[PDB]
């Protein structure tokens, strides 16, 4: 519903454009496959899953992306070096253009994932997730040797759940570090930093998450986004209220698909909308808020990159 | 995430406070009842309806509003002068404090309801919902005699589908030259002018609808809202895609509910969320954005009117 004065940078990773003024480029819906307790992953430690039944989940996002025009990016979660290596190996053989966040909670795996991506040549399509404030010295070493050029920087200021804390952990750095997390990325060889707001639980710093979306875009200009569905997933009241009603998912879904829409209208450029199995409910909701953003942009004077494949044209 | 410079006017209508800075007051949730093809309504012309399940649809919202903290207001919808009088008599006979919007498409019915509420004694509660450019001399002359001090000023320029067009019908006046609708209402007794942004359908004026929420609020200072769910219910593409999915409602509801959360974060003070049967899905979603709006209010400097009953403290 607004345009930004600070010239927004747009990063074209593997045919997907991250960044730009609100409405210039469509929102980049980032799915999540092989997450914790995925129904297709049989052997989580060894990375053994149902390869035939996973291509159907991906082809559901591919076909719905061609109707709405919303670009899609995978996020291959893994917890062991062997598992994430077989997950990455499968993904690049079924599709050859779409980027993938190599996400993991253990820095050893992201260390292993970074080496494998450059080993087999698919490194310009890999987004390292994420360069947070707890990154150790070993993780920098493997990242800078690797050929990964795009990475997600997590605007996490642990003892500062405020907008100024998120700015400070990227600008000056927080506690336990001396350089801003947006400059640690530069020395890691990341030419394409992509800020993550690090959404906080509801009632413990959730308002700063949504007010940092138009603040970390009008201050840095780099692509801004994150996983906002974690706010409704950590909500204790909803987890209790939704069980009383006959359909637990009928009530939780509008709230879970409402965190993205609220942040999208505030200027978010990509949405870690969670499990891949929610494709048919997030795309209609997100492409709607992209018609709203693609209308103000056409009226506020913002130029749209590809108007023919915008949700404001295909779906109107 | 906003804090308007223009001082926002708070109107108290039977305990439901309309307006204020984003986060100052909990979002009002107007709920349409007795609408077209309501299951309870059996004779749409003599206003028969169930009158037993009708309480069940109204007690549900009271209990939810006493769990979330969001104010609740009814919107009585009638098509004939006899039908609308039948609904007001029932509603005032079950609830004695909550206001209502006597809504109707025809002018002669709205005037009849506004005149009827004066004779019954409940007209400080009526929120008679039309002050539009398509108003005849008959309706303004009966609304002046009736003791209705609140009205929903609808900012609908048929000629100009822009945000400037919304301003001009309120301040200067368009089709129906001079005496803008915000200045017609003052001269027909309306003491509490509540602004409606007149949500235009998706693809034509749906961008000006969301950018008018922070525009008309920061220009006039009066409470801002509207029926944003009409943007999604009148979407042609969604109707086609929805009917192919196994569960048509589970695809549509996140989109329909998302029209309100998107406009709520912009600064909307009340939300016409549609049928009252959707009360279990809009309250959790709207209350989630009030926690988010109730935290930036305590960070930007806004003073929450009653912290002990805000969704930021009742929930979480």
């Amino acid at each position: 519903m607004f345009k930004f004065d600070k010239k927004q940078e747009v990063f074209e990773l593997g045919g997907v454009k991250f960044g730009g003024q609100p409405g210039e480029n469509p929102t980049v819906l980032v799915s999540t496959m092989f997450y914790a307790r995925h129904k297709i992953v049989t052997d989580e430690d060894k990375g053994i899953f149902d390869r035939a039944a996973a291509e159907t989940l991906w082809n559901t996002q591919v076909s719905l992306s061609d109707a709405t025009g919303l670009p899609y990016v995978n996020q291959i979660v893994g917890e062991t070096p062997e598992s994430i290596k077989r997950y990455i190996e499968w993904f690049v053989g079924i599709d050859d253009r779409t980027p993938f966040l190599i996400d993991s909670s253990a820095g050893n795996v992201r260390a292993a994932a970074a080496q494998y991506c450059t080993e087999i040549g698919v490194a310009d399509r890999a987004i390292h997730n994420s360069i947070n404030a707890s990154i150790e010295q070993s993780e920098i070493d493997v990242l800078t040797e690797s050929d990964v050029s795009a990475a997600i920087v997590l605007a996490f200021n642990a003892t500062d759940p405020t907008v100024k804390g998120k700015i400070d952990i990227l600008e000056v750095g927080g506690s336990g570090q001396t350089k801003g997390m947006l400059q640690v990325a530069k020395e890691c060889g990341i030419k394409y930093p992509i800020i993550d707001v690090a959404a906080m639980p509801l009632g413990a710093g959730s308002g700063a998450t949504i007010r940092s979306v138009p603040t970390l875009k009008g201050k840095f200009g780099l692509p801004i986004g994150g996983g906002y569905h974690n706010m409704a997933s950590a909500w204790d009241w909803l987890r209790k209220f939704k069980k009383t009603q006959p359909d637990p998912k009928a009530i939780y879904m509008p709230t879970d698909i409402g965190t993205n829409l609220v942040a999208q209208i505030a200027g978010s450029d990509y949405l870690l909308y969670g499990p891949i199995e929610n494709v048919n409910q997030i795309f209609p909701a997100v492409a709607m808020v992209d018609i709203m953003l693609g209308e103000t942009a056409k009226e506020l004077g913002v130029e749209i990159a590809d108007l023919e494949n915008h949700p404001v044209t295909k779906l109107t | 995430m906003f804090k308007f410079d223009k001082k926002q006017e708070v109107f108290e209508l039977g305990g439901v406070k309309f307006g204020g800075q984003p986060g100052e007051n909990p979002t009002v949730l107007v709920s349409t009842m007795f609408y077209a093809r309501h299951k309870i309504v059996t004779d749409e012309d003599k206003g028969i309806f169930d009158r037993a399940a009708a309480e069940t649809l109204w007690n549900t919202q009271v209990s939810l509003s006493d769990a979330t903290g969001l104010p609740y207001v009814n919107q009585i919808v009638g098509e004939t002068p006899e039908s609308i009088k039948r609904y007001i008599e029932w509603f005032v006979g079950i609830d004695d404090r909550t206001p209502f919007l006597i809504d109707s498409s025809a002018g002669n019915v709205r005037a009849a309801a506004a005149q009827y509420c004066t004779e019954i004694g409940v007209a400080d509660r009526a929120i008679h919902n039309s002050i539009n450019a398509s108003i005849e001399q008959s309706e303004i002359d009966v609304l002046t005699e009736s003791d209705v001090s609140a009205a929903i000023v609808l900012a609908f320029n048929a000629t100009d589908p822009t945000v400037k067009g919304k301003i001009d019908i309120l301040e200067v006046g368009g089709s129906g030259q001079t005496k803008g609708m915000l200045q017609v209402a003052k001269e027909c007794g309306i003491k509490y002018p509540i602004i409606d942004v007149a949500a235009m359908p998706l693809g034509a004026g749906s961008g000006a609808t969301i950018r008018s929420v922070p525009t008309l609020k920061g220009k006039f200072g009066l409470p801002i809202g509207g029926g944003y769910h009409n943007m999604a219910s009148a979407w042609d593409w969604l109707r086609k895609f929805k009917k192919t999915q196994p569960d048509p409602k589970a695809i549509y509801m996140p989109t329909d509910i998302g029209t309100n959360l998107v406009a709520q974060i912009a600064g909307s003070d009340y939300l016409l969320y549609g049928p009252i049967e959707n009360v279990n899905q809009i309250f959790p979603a709207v209350a989630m954005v009030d926690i988010m709006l109730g935290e930036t209010a305590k960070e930007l400097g806004v003073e929450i009117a009653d912290l002990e009953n805000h969704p930021v403290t009742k929930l979480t």
């Binding site: 607004f2 600070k6 907008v163 875009k217 | 906003f2 525009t215």
Partner: peptide, 27 residues
């Protein structure tokens, strides 16, 4: 015309007449 405040820290602010999200100049 409304200077809608969204970030007093970095001085960021909206501008409702133009729709821009600018930064209030102290000058």
């Amino acid at each position: 015309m409304s200077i809608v405040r969204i970030a007093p820290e970095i001085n960021l602010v909206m501008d409702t007449e133009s729709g821009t999200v600018t930064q209030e100049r102290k000058d």
